[PDB]
Ligand binder design. Structure first.
Ligand SMILES: [Ca+2]
Ligand SMILES: [Ca+2]
Ligand SMILES: [Ca+2]
Ligand SMILES: [Ca+2]
Ligand SMILES: [Zn+2]
Ligand SMILES: [Zn+2]
Ligand SMILES: [Zn+2]
Ligand SMILES: [Zn+2]
Ligand SMILES: [Zn+2]
Length: 328
């Protein structure tokens, strides 16, 4: 029989430093089978799969010998070292914890939900591929590469929050992953990355990926939410959108919008994310334009009792014309 247990071990990487689960952060929620002295990187909410640098797997949980707490890793030392990271599998289990609990504690919702409304386990596929410099959502699970020359393993709170939140979006508004809706989809995932950081450690970087870009790569971050165009390709305002702009660059519009809103007088990140989550759940449609997206935010803010003037001001600063769909 499998019962709950606690895992001790390490996380982080050469860029941000190493930390320890059981000292600097909580112990990991693992499962154990006494009868065989085997532990599994899995709990009801999150399962970590060690892809073993392959591209396909049966999705059995990562299992390690454990002869109430146990060191993680195949050598029971707390490590699963890879491309400059201490243990991407430990970090993935914790990242799933954080994103699950942010959505549940702040919104009373399951991060991932089955069609019948019951909770869907977060399946985190780690060690995916050889030198794979990407992470993605595929409609049922989240997949994370170990990186190569530009990036450390793509397992952090922010990247995990981004990828799980593609699933949250698919299961709520369904924003399609191209055009303006796709820019919004990307942005919502970048906003959730920030929410995961803030929920867990009480601060967020306003950047995507600084914790996983290698310092010798020439890049400090993948994206900047305070001024997206700092990366040389993303746009800061909707008027700079054009058809064919990649979703990872048109995401600047709603990333900048979220930054602006969260920093208005008497706002904060949580309030701004409250508006975006409620819009995702209740108003945004699969085909949304940036403009319709702003109308959804105003309707969501009205439902929450928040100040619509602050929403309108932020929308106008990113050149969104909400008047087509919201008249008051
Ligand atoms: Ca299972
Ligand atoms: Ca599939
Ligand atoms: Ca290499
Ligand atoms: Ca290098
Ligand atoms: Zn629940
Ligand atoms: Zn690996
Ligand atoms: Zn994405
Ligand atoms: Zn700005
Ligand atoms: Zn792209």
């Amino acid at each position: 029989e499998k019962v709950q247990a606690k895992g001790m071990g390490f996380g982080g990487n050469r860029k941000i430093g190493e930390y320890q689960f059981g000292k600097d952060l909580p112990l990991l929620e693992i499962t154990r089978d006494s009868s065989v002295e085997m532990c599994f990187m899995e709990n009801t909410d999150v399962k970590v799969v060690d892809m073993g640098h392959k591209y396909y797997s049966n999705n059995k949980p990562m299992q390690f010998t454990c002869k109430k707490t146990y060191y993680t890793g195949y050598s029971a030392d707390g490590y699963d070292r890879d491309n400059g990271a201490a243990s991407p599998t430990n970090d993935a289990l914790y990242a799933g914890y954080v994103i699950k609990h942010m959505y549940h504690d702040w919104y009373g919702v399951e991060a991932l939900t089955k069609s019948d409304g019951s909770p869907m386990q977060l399946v985190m596929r780690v060690h995916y591929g050889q030198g794979y410099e990407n992470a993605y959502w595929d409609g049922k699970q989240m997949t994370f590469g170990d990186g190569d020359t530009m990036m450390y393993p793509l397992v952090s709170l922010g990247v995990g929050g981004h990828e799980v939140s593609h699933g949250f979006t698919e299961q709520h508004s369904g924003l399609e992953y191209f055009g303006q809706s796709g820019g919004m989809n990307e942005s919502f995932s970048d906003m959730a990355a920030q929410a995961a950081e803030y929920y867990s450690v009480g601060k967020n970087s306003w950047q995507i990926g600084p914790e996983i870009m290698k310092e010798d790569s020439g890049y400090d971050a993948l994206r900047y939410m305070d001024k997206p165009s700092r990366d040389g390709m993303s746009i800061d305002v909707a008027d700079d959108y054009y058809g064919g702009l990649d979703v990872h660059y048109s995401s600047g519009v709603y990333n900048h919008l979220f930054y602006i809103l969260a920093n208005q007088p008497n706002w904060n990140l949580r309030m701004a994310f409250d508006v975006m989550v409620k819009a995702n759940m209740d108003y945004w449609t699969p085909y949304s334009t940036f403009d319709e997206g702003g109308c959804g935010m105003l309707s969501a803010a009205k439902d929450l009792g928040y100040n619509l003037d602050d929403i309108k001001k932020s929308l106008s600063e990113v050149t969104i014309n909400y008047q087509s769909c919201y008249v008051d």
